[PDB]
């Protein structure tokens, strides 16, 4: 439901950075904080918006 548009490799980039960020805590168990940290360290650049002109 977020209009991420993150073409179908970088789901694994989310998976890599998120799970290995849990490896900074060395837990194998996944939070929702992985999703926020992998939505503010991935293609959060362009974004989101522009929502003018349609």
């Amino acid at each position: 439901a977020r209009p991420d548009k993150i073409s179908g490799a970088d789901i694994n980039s989310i998976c890599q950075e998120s799970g290995m960020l849990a490896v900074r805590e060395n837990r194998y168990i996944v939070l929702a904080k992985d999703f926020e940290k992998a939505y503010k360290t991935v293609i959060k650049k362009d974004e989101q918006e522009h929502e003018f002109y349609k």
């Binding site: 439901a1 989101q48 918006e49 929502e51 003018f52 002109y53 349609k54």
Partner: protein, 230 residues
């Protein structure tokens, strides 16, 4: 790297700055409009970006007179400009003739305005495609325009994202003879074919045109009707 700008033709083709405005129209929010036997149904697709926005401030379906509806698929900031122009022009017609303006004369004059902006050479065209309708002298009408100044006449059409897919559904689903309610049913069907999965009383915004006049429906009856209409 050519054409650039608006004053000179291509080596063989067309007016690239109008084709790009048409592409910007085709990249816009979807809409559908159907001419039935007694009335015309317009329907747009209005998604807020966040959960913060209000649905009582900006309006897509917009009346030009008490019996003439008009939607678009493009940019609101140009839409409001040419809406205001059409307002003033229709009231000038009613000053001159003391009679509510017919829709063909509206489409002629609005097309003249858009054409005058397509003339050279400093202003850009509108990134707006209209869908004009009204019930003049019994028979209702439906007139689509475009940024190029042209106009058409439809029985049912669509504009926006996946207008090709919605149109191929319109060719299969729609016919010649319906009523306004069945028109709204097939209109919300063909808009629900292409819109997102969450369609509520606010994501759509629907106005109709009976012979008794234009009517812009409320979220009450829109939520009553699209509460799983099929």
């Amino acid at each position: 790297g050519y054409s650039f700008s608006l004053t000179t033709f291509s080596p063989s083709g067309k007016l690239v700055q109008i084709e790009y405005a048409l592409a910007a129209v085709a990249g816009g929010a979807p809409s559908v409009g159907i001419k039935a036997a007694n009335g015309v149904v317009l329907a747009t697709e209005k998604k807020q970006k966040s959960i913060l926005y209000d649905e009582r401030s900006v309006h897509k379906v917009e009346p030009i007179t008490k019996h003439i509806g008009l939607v678009y698929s493009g940019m609101g900031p140009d839409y409001r400009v040419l809406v205001h122009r059409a307002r003033k022009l229709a009231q000038q017609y009613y000053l001159v003739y003391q009679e509510p303006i017919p829709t063909a004369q509206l489409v002629q004059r609005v097309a003249s305005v858009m054409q005058e902006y397509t003339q050279s050479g400093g202003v850009r065209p509108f990134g707006v495609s209209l869908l004009i309708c009204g019930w003049n002298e019994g028979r209702p009408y439906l007139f689509q325009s475009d940024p190029s100044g042209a106009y058409f006449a439809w029985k049912a059409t669509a504009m926006g994202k996946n207008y090709v897919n919605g149109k191929t559904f319109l060719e299969k689903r729609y016919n010649e003879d319906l009523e306004l309610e069945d028109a709204i049913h097939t209109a919300i069907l063909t808009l629900k074919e292409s819109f997102e999965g969450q369609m509520t009383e606010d994501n759509i915004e629907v106005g109709i045109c009976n012979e008794a006049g234009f009517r812009r429906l409320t979220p009450t009856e829109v939520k009553d009707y699209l509460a799983a209409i099929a």
